[PDB]
Design a protein around this ligand. Sequence first.
Ligand SMILES: C[S@@+](CC[C@H](N)C(=O)[O-])C[C@H]1O[C@@H](n2cnc3c(N)ncnc32)[C@H](O)[C@@H]1O
Ligand code: SF4
Ligand code: SF4
Ligand code: SF4
Ligand SMILES: [Ca+2]
Ligand SMILES: [Ca+2]
Lengths: 11, 440
Amino acid sequence: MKHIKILNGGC
Amino acid sequence: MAMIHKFSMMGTNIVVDVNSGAVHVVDDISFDILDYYKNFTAGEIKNKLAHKYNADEIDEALREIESLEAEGLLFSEDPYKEYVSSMDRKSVVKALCLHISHDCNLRCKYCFASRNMMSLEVGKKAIDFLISESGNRKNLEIDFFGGEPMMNFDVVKGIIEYARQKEKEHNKNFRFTLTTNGLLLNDENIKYINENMQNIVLSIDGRKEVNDRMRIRIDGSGCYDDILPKFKYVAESRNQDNYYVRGTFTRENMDFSNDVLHLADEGFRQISVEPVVAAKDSGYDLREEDLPRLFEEYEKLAYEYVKRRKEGNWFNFFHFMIDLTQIVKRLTGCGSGHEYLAVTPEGDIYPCHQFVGNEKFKMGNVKEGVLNRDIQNYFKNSNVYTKKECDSCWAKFYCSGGCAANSYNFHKDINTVYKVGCELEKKRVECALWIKAQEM
Ligand SMILES: C[S@@+](CC[C@H](N)C(=O)[O-])C[C@H]1O[C@@H](n2cnc3c(N)ncnc32)[C@H](O)[C@@H]1O
Ligand code: SF4
Ligand code: SF4
Ligand code: SF4
Ligand SMILES: [Ca+2]
Ligand SMILES: [Ca+2]
């Protein structure tokens, strides 16, 4: 969008 | 229930929608609106932020937010919730950690080792036990472990040949891991290792002073000078793949980014440096007072991590690796006590290597093959969906599930979360998310 940006669209 | 987590790290604002796994990079105004979006109307929000943002730009960011919620990427509900109400699940053992020897040639101080060789007969029993308890799963894992496994390397080789022959009749495929302190590696057994070990873990804690403070021969001297060239040789003979160097950091080395970056500067592409386990009343455990310094340490390691990957002198850090494309994982964890079990040279079965010292947790012995199902089911049903603390935790679907050993070591109850462990684990996830955001 403009204000939001979607990032994902041991033992 | 529906839940988000938002944090700001080194200038980037990040929003985690818990149930869907969606991750968002947001500007400052969206970040602020999210403080209020669920409990206030658009009109109330416009008044609460009017000192900083004008009404038009708030409605604009607002119109993006519920559009994201309308399509299940913010404040989404949990679709797996109704299904999990199962506790009669037959467990399937997928992996064994074989304590090939309880003797070692070091007295590493944080270690449970601080005795016997496993017989080929016990090891063969452990293979047959894993076949009969793995049901219809083809891919089985064997970690050669203990104290130092290479002090009983002939039994390791017989186990491999034994298991490699049982594959045909049972439609199995064994994958073998070896974890060694390195002191007894040489050209000939590394040749065998590269023919037969799908994975090898090489133990070194970082800088020489950090390593030789903790990983100590019985005479008291260090091992860094001996093991370091052997490890680079192994690393390069495996094309910098299918291995990692494994460090443990304690309260003694809380500037542990220096140790990760020392291993990187020595050429290791594959690195894991992890907090000490079960170090209650040891002088070593990371405490609550230490979390601010450790948080800053993870952040400075992440920044340098992005920089080296940008500039090409890359390395992989296990705790920064994360898959943003994802119920089976949420119910299993590390699997100790039910999907992953340890076997002593005597052949006694325990949930994992951290419980081997306590017969309250002995579940049987492979020479007989009869597993205590009540202990198996108790570890099985202690998970992220049944612990109350995990239910309100935003990292529930990213975290590794907690560590029963830490839980028992600090609270005498595998079901009580070890808070310091969770906060380190949550911070690690935050860093791994920021790294993904930097490399869009
Ligand atoms: C327990 S040793 C046994 C295998 C082999 N002798 C070796 O050192 O690689 C395997 C790994 O577990 C790590 N380890 C030992 N005690 C630990 C603890 N209390 N917390 C976290 N890691 C530990 C060691 O540093 C080593 O990297
Ligand atoms: S870490 Fe590996 S080497 Fe050091 S004591 Fe424990 S078992 Fe022996
Ligand atoms: S971090 Fe700790 S609390 Fe949060 S889910 Fe994982 S184990 Fe449970
Ligand atoms: S219980 Fe803790 S120590 Fe044992 S396997 Fe799981 S993570 Fe490792
Ligand atoms: Ca911050
Ligand atoms: Ca800002």
